[PDB]
Design a protein around this ligand. Structure first.
Ligand SMILES: Nc1nc2c(ncn2[C@@H]2O[C@@H]3COP(=O)(O)O[C@H]4[C@@H](O)[C@H](n5cnc6c(=O)[nH]c(N)nc65)O[C@@H]4COP(=O)(O)O[C@H]3[C@H]2O)c(=O)[nH]1
Ligand SMILES: [Ca+2]
Ligand SMILES: [Ca+2]
Length: 263
């Protein structure tokens, strides 16, 4: 309990010190493996414990009431990294960076202005920074969310629905929420091979994506066979260990540059 308490206390200063920082997992076109963007995922590079994963620390951030602070940091850091990459590769194709919105953030006063500020200082074009919003956050009050999403889109953010299948039936409300991207949870991707229900959900979501004109991104693409299975079903984008995990910025840079060189 003491080690956990020590870590919790460390959150007083860790966010400000930049120790909780984004790593970047590639999102690729499955047909060719071409890079489309990255998802920024929080990593706490603890000065003594080394790299800690979000499942270990996000509950502590929640208990400490520091979700907004983490979210602001992650947004700024992802956006700055994107701006740095764009300045270094001015002739490159599109490259998006996605950031996970901290729960309860969607309806926090000031979020739209914070997003707008981030886009302006980083000179980003519309859609380059994408916000991944969780089903629970959206479905807690879908009409309110619809308006905030429109305001975020108008400010210049791209928008993704993350974690469908949490339990709120977001799929049947999706026609009324202005997302541009839908993510398929790795649970469905991992189980579609052996379970008819999961296979059915993935086929159906790809179809809804086509009919609502959303980009569909499969998460947890662990290998070549999952990638081909997804492509046959009409899923064109994916992220997973079959490509790369969330990479340090130095590794991500090599990764993107190699994609730019063979584009
Ligand atoms: N086994 C397996 N896992 C794969 C594979 N491909 C991707 N993943 C993992 O799946 C998770 C995808 O992110 P998420 O669903 O938004 O799920 C995220 C998100 O809900 C939350 N999270 C991460 N970063 C942030 C952040 O900056 N802010 C907030 N609020 N939440 C975050 O923590 C969750 C866990 O993040 P991670 O541990 O980085 O775990 C990541 C990623 O590393 C694969 O092929 N196999
Ligand atoms: Ca996500
Ligand atoms: Ca997800």
């Amino acid at each position: 309990g003491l080690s956990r308490l020590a870590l919790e206390a460390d959150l007083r200063g860790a966010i400000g010190r930049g120790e909780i920082t984004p790593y970047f997992q590639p999102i690729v076109r499955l047909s060719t493996g071409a890079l489309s963007g990255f998802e920024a995922l929080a990593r706490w590079i603890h000065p003594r414990r080394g790299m800690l994963p979000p499942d270990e620390f996000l509950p502590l951030i929640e208990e400490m009431g520091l979700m907004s602070e983490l979210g602001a940091h992650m947004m700024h850091a992802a956006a700055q990294q994107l701006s740095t990459w764009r300045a270094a590769h001015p002739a490159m194709g599109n490259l998006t960076v996605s950031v996970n919105l901290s729960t309860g953030e969607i309806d926090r006063p000031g979020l739209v202005a914070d997003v707008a500020e981030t886009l302006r200082v980083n000179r980003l074009p519309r859609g380059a920074l994408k916000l991944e919003v969780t089903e629970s956050d959206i479905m807690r009050d879908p009409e309110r969310a619809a308006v905030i999403l429109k305001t975020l889109r108008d400010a210049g953010a791209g928008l993704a629905l993350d974690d469908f299948g949490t339990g709120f039936s977001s799929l049947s409300y999706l026609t009324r929420l202005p997302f541009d991207t839908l993510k398929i949870d790795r649970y469905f991707v991992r189980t579609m091979g052996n379970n008819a229900g999961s296979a059915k959900i993935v086929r159906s979501v790809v179809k809804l994506g086509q009919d609502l004109d959303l980009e569909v991104v499969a998460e947890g693409v662990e290998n070549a066979e999952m990638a081909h299975a997804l492509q046959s079903l009409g899923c064109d984008y994916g992220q997973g260990f079959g490509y790369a995990p969330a990479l340090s910025p130095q590794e991500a840079e090599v990764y993107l540059n190699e994609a730019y060189v063979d584009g």
